[model samples]
Target chain A: DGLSNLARRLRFAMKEGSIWLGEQRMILLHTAALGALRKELVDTLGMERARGLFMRMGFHSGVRDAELAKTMRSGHSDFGMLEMGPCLHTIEGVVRVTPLTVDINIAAGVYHGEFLWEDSFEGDVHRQMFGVAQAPVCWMQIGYATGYTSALMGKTILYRELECVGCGHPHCRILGKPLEQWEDGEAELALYQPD
Target chain B: DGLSNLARRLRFAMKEGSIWLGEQRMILLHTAALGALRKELVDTLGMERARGLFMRMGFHSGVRDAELAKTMRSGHSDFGMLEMGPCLHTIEGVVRVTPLTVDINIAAGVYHGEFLWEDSFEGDVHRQMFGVAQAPVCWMQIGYATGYTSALMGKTILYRELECVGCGHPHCRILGKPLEQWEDGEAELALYQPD
Candidate 1:
């Protein structure tokens, strides 16, 4: 309840022509715009570049929110702060993130998380526009989880979308672990290195 | 009231673990994340490149909404459909748009719009991190107007922010017209040409 129940702590506001959540301004963006952006980027820059850019976008947003979660959950335990990530991610409307499991040790920097994403806006819309793909299309969502946990843990964490809604999966699911744990992490890390 | 009154048409819903506004999904993003994004872009790619990507972002969002407005305002007068742009933009939490004047001929490709923006989240946030600028800072708002109107008008319209909150102005104000109308149009047009 502490993680999910904290939704009551903030309100989405319409004041003076802007929306606010707590002290932060919140913008409401449509999925079509998000879809259109991906289409534009893919049309202009091809698939890989579009994926990289969006991943980077989500990654940085995650890093920003990692710091925010800490401040918001001050005086809470380490798990308490970590728990807010999915709750806030859900509140952000990226997805309703259900944490299936987590075995984490913040001090020693060993962490793992399994999450099921219900109705991921990105992958569903991506499927709508481009049809089912061979690869997982939850690029931004993965990057967000990666960057968020990495920032919070003070180490490089990487996430992989093992199953994606765009790939005809029932749910968008991800597995995350430390950078060195993945055999192919070098390529994944390069994707975060946006120009 | 038709324009502003349409706020009740769509409800922000939490359904099946997803957020929805009509058929489209809505995503909530934090201002600090937005602020952090602009900072990272500027630091990584300089002001000009950062402006291009963000402006293109707003521009495409406008185009998508223009289509949505048509669907929502079907059989409405030209002016009526045009009116929804500001209302929808307001609901999107990008800014509260107040139209000063507009004269347009869709068939003739002649158009003009003057508007004031209150509570401009982007420019104000930009100012918070980067200080006041010699030039206007409402780049994305200008691009949104440009793309939205240009699509509706079937011509390349361009908008210029003559005054911006980020530049210490009283309000964010803009003037929009057909691309050919501005002698320096080449310069402004380049900003929307994201690669």
Candidate 2:
């Protein structure tokens, strides 16, 4: 009921133009907007590079998030990812998305209604599917990522996405050759599925 | 020496191709590369909408970073954005960049390095120059933004930016007519330099 209630408010935000859902806005900023415009002049054109950009940003964010979490939660203690209790990790100082949710681990002193992902893709097909979904999917991931990462870090992180989702396609062969992108746009939503 | 040592290690990691820096390999990720490339695209294509995509991604990361920070830094109720240090407040959220170098007091904690802003310029000039930089310059601001917002919500947050320092051009202009089209770009970069 609360989720539904919040969803209602979100719908209102969208209807009134107060806010837009999904990662469209984020992607736009990269593709046709600020980052893209600049990149076009500097790098090769199209979405191929957009994906590259995403990984770079994500990787750095991941590392920073991990470090921040380490500092906030365990105070630089090395609690193996599993010991950390459902966590996210980055090696190259990049960004990463780790989902969070409501769950309890009484033994670990972990709190409920917390952040954690339903699965771990290990930078495989799931990551690629994520790239395909773009903004909306990513935005959802952002929510979970922020929640989970925050819980791990002992701080809170917010997630927001732009309104203009699924606007541009990467011109690179991986993104552009198929011309049929956004195949698994709903993967993020699946995380909320009831069992 | 520290900066140079870090730089040397970074260069080596990048050169080795498989070298891991923090957590992931140094190989560029989508977000970081996008932060760099997106600006490049915007410059050449004049595609403004695409910038939203990039921003969207950043926004999501900011949110999550904030929440995670909350859990990471327990007992320090106001440590997120309001922590004693430099803070950046934005529509999405507040991001605080606290430092580990010095002790943090309630008023204005110690920081290892001062905020760098020698590149300040007029609105249009700043935007144009930022667009050309192709590197993420706002990581500091974004970190502050995410931290502040998450802290506001009693959660921890972390923010990271996909920067491109490789193609920095501190003062430049968007060529073409209307001039109004460049306003958004100008406004975006202007947010980083408050004064």
Candidate 3:
């Protein structure tokens, strides 16, 4: 099975009134409503605070799911585990990820990744609330990729959203790199830190 | 074919990258992250604004789902269409509804219903953020039941959280009645209005 096999693990406990994806409890959320809250948060919390709030929230999920992902693919290749992040994210309905480029060597501590996102709820929320942002605003998804990859590779990985539907891009796109590689990696990492 | 039959209608276009309850698009969101968001919104937005925010969001879902429910249960019993609301909500992984009492005569314009909620994501989010709320804090569910019933009956149905797990109750319980029956019906209905 290629990467899509994870769908087999999504368990629906309808009678018990709960759902799970690879041992992680999940719930179905309406994007419009979620976007509604995002708009409120941005207005109330200010741009940087609201951005960090969502980023930290996504980071928590990334780290927790990464812990579970390790167990799912035992002794698997580093790249395989990396792919699982996007797969898990898709299955969880956060976003649909398509990797455009990948170059990762965990042993040598080098990472350069580019990925395209489709049907991102966060970007749609931004557009729904306030059209055409000045810059990419997929803060939560960016934080998730960074945290998920870092937890798996045992190194600090950071992701930057270079293009986003929020910025009127065709699609959301992000660049992932090692902590030392980015010019302001430390400042970016602090954004993902628990607030 | 009990009320649970609606689950069979849930469409999952995994390859197409979408999920739906009836015709509504849904996404799997991590409860913890959503809880994190609820907690953040509560603090920054304050209880009054946050309460109204969540209520309005859930109300939109209720009204939208009500629209879809009408199409599904045409010429069916009035009670049958009402049951579909809870069925659809459970299918969406929002909460588990257990009706305690029902006294509804749509033609007569009389409505008095009571329901118990188990596994409410909203209540759990409240507890996760702060323990033992002063009063029932299940704002979204309250608004949902109100909006759902109101839309179905073509009359304003108001639901109030009499007891809730967020307030440290064993579980959440609610009472629904026609708008005029409740002394504060006007005030309650305004909460569901969109911002």
Candidate 4:
């Protein structure tokens, strides 16, 4: 219910040419190419900057999509509009999002959600190219969640990949909370909005 | 004169989501990703099929590009339209194509051109990831030239990389001719239009 309706809408949007998120045009790229790109980025820019670049890319995409959702569904509830984030992602063929639990109190600017991810292109590419990592490697996905939720809630939200297939996990799982919710949230959050 | 005008046009076209080659949408991608994809294809499908896939991708792109070139300059000489191939490639940030010599006789369906390529994303990535190959390794560029010329001349044309930076050559150079011109032309041509 959270994603199926949203996915259907996006498929229709793609027929025009491409799925546009503001000024950014989305294209279907093979995952292998993405893996190689990741390697090159890391090779050229080092880990911190490359992670920042990927996160920024997703962050921009998320912010753009958030703007569109607001205009298109003006009177909709926060739950309905926020759900579009994962749905748009699924439609983009980047990953399949299944919401496990969602808790939100928009009046108090509090929001949190947990989701299970499958067929993650980022995780798949990382595993294929770099094998397993000790930490979660789904940097772009995390950025997307944070960007989308933050834009929707009008406050900064941070999402962390608690478990990742690239980190030798069975599946990818994510947890999102307000900026002050996690102890070390600011450390990870810095990458999303670098100075 | 051959490429300067065409390159200007392509720079404008890129701003509109993708470079349109008639009905096909041309997406810009990082060569590192392309190189990674090349490795995956060769590993999974063996050398022959992998080469075929890359060639086919360029072949189709070439064909579509030819169609757009034709409509854009309806009364232009065939020589001008064919020259746009390398120009478009350059504007797309794939390579810088410098024409050394070109001889085309459209009425006789004869086309031969020699070119020097610099800053080849494919060759750079190939060297970075796969090291040097014993033979020239600009497969997609070869495919593009062949398909573009073949469509322009209304005949089957083939292109081969005589030298490539990926193979330790000082630079990359390509020669394109009609399908029957070379000794192993038939074998190489088979890769372009595989059964």
Candidate 5:
């Protein structure tokens, strides 16, 4: 019931030409070019700074989408609107987002989720550029989930990739929780706040 | 009156994300990637086939944009819609097209124009990948002008880059004329049809 209704609403919302979220116009760019751009950013800004840059980019996108979701589905339940995050990701052709588990009580300000990703363009590009890495590398995806969930819940939520294809995992898996729930969340939260 | 009013309309029409013309979805790709792609196409399909591919890509974009212009300016004069071609090219950010000369008679099926391009992304990419060349190298731009004019005038109009920044010219300049107007129009027309 939920998924089908959401799909119908999304079909009406998504279309070719510029997609406007408030006054901001969204651009659909090829992942390969984005891959190339990531390479450029890393080369130009070094690894740490590039990570922050990409994270910030995704964070902004997530924030914008959160605003759009609220505006578009004001009559629906919070869960109904929040679920649109994965739908928007798929619509933009960035990645296939599968919710392994979702737990949320908006009234209580408690939210947690486990998500799996397939055909991650970022991971694919990382593998192409650097072969297998020693760490998970879905930096932007993690940032996006964090930003989207945080905005939706009106609390700071963070996401981290537990396993990534870039680091030789079979598939990418991520976990999200409230900021204080994770031991290392402070560091992750710091990355979201750009200097 | 013509250029000013058309510019105003284009400002409203242009935005980020996938541009649509009828059912077609137009993608905005970086010039560097396109240049890399051009090299790949040339290596894989040989120079002639690659040329055909790029030309046809531009041709289709031109055709679609012409249709879009007609639809957007249904109430305006035909010339009002026709002028939007150059404006659309600029809006797409591939180049800043400036008309140096213009002569067209829709009733007589005659059209001719001379355009100068500044900051041509294609030319910039070509120059980055391959140094200055002996002759004009704005193949895509040439194809675009030909296709746009041809579709706008309802007759086959051919355009050739007389000089290109990629080819060591002071500026990129293109000349457009009807199929019979130029000595080499037949050969140029062959590139558009593609086998």
Candidate 6:
């Protein structure tokens, strides 16, 4: 009876995977990763240390992102530090963070754009300035925009393709807002409404 | 030279990914999930609650797994209750819990299957028990096995195609042990090493 009953219940849970955030379903892949990681962390380290490491990593990322924002601002005194709020996602009428930092929440939508670099630095100089190559850097910036917007919205938000072209510096509009505001072209704002 | 240097770095990272569990390859997904979760949780519940919730959930899982191990009682009782070590894979790890008292350890490759008579009365059976007329609990069991193993190994591991009459329970005897380990097999070893 125990085995039979368990079999029955599992069938139901399987019908509905762990939990979902709106249309973004929680697949079998997600559930297993959590299970494996939980085991590994607990076995490798203690549970306390494990949890601390994850929380620390997220907090550290926020701190690092703030630093990165500072780099973007450079010597501007007016542009205050960008503060990233804690991450969140919707699941079963409640928000949970069992998985790694969730993406569905912060992505607002996608915006297409070309890389407007005013710096006259050659490839080496450019690479030295940004630390990463310009192309990859653009991708990360676009990715952050998508992720940040999704986190704010609590659903999957897409980012439009990016266009990056090298340009001359000094005369360029350096140390200023890239755009008045990010434009989400024809993108629907996805929400996780409770059923 | 710049492009070539970038290519070399990319190749090196790819090689590392191919070689073993390198930090870059593993941490990206891990950190991404953490970031996503933090954003969602913070949005849903405030930051303090989100932090507390993650820590508590991870802790509770380690505790629950320890209890479940008593019932499952594998050869290595001493090594029951796997630690998560870090936040790298907490999401998939913790969500795998089945009310019938099954706790899977991702790192140690151990699954604590603890089913008792009380769990039956509580109707806290496996997910399969919810509905379906004799849908065969084996499917759900194999499903969990497949889910956890795939997440950990980063590959798909499915039940053997062959089906047996009567119990319909999944067994390694049908699909080679190299693929999966069934309790009814000649080996009867719960701890399996993937090749």
TM-score of each: 0.81, 0.28, 0.90, 0.53, 0.52, 0.24
In model 3, where do residues sit more than 4 Å from their true spots?
A1-5, A193-195, B105-109
- lDDT of model 1 at position B90: 81
Query: Candidate 3 on A5-26: residue-level lDDT in tens?
Result: 6667778877656777766677
The sequence of per-residue lDDT tens digits that candidate 4 reaches over residues B1-195 is 334545344321311222332344333332433554566455545766767666765676566567656667756676777777776665555566778999998888878889988766566667876788777777766777777788878999888888898898878999888878888988887787534
What does the interface RMSD come to for each candidate?
Answer: 2.9, 16.2, 2.0, 12.3, 11.6, 17.2
lDDT of 2 by residue, A131-164 (tens): 3444322322343343333445344333333311
Q: DockQ (C-alpha) of model 5?
A: 0.06
Candidate 3's residue-wise lDDT over B67-163, tens digit each?
A: 7788876567877788877777777777788878878777887788888889877887788778878978888777778778889888988888888
Spell out the clash pairs found in candidate 1. Answer: none
> Best-fitting candidate, measured by lDDT?
3
TM-score winner between candidates 5 and 6: 5
Candidate 2, RMSD to the unseen true structure = 19.7
Interface RMSD of 4: 12.3
Following a full C-alpha superposition, what root-mean-square deviation does model 3 have from the true structure? 2.5
TM-score of chain B of each: 0.91, 0.34, 0.93, 0.87, 0.85, 0.23
Worst 10 residues of 1 chain A by lDDT: A3-12
CA lDDT, candidate 5, residue A118: 75
Q: Candidate 3 - CAPRI tier?
A: medium
Q: What is the DockQ for all candidates, taken in turn?
A: 0.45, 0.04, 0.54, 0.05, 0.06, 0.06
lDDT for residue A111 in candidate 2, whole number 0-100: 33
For model 6 chain B, the run of ten residues with the poorest summed lDDT: B115-124
Candidate 4: C-alpha RMSD to true structure equals 12.7
Residue-level lDDT of model 5, residues A1-195, one tens digit each, is 333343333321121212333333433333433564466456545777667756766776676667766777657776676777765554444556788888887778978888888766578677888788887887776766777788999999888888899998878998888889898878877777634
Best DockQ among the predictions, by candidate number = 3
Residue-by-residue lDDT tens digits, candidate 5, B147-186: 7778878899888887888887767988888899889778
- Model 6 stretches with alpha carbons more than 4 Å out: A1-82, A85-141, A147-195, B1-93, B96-195
Backbone-clash count (model 6): 74
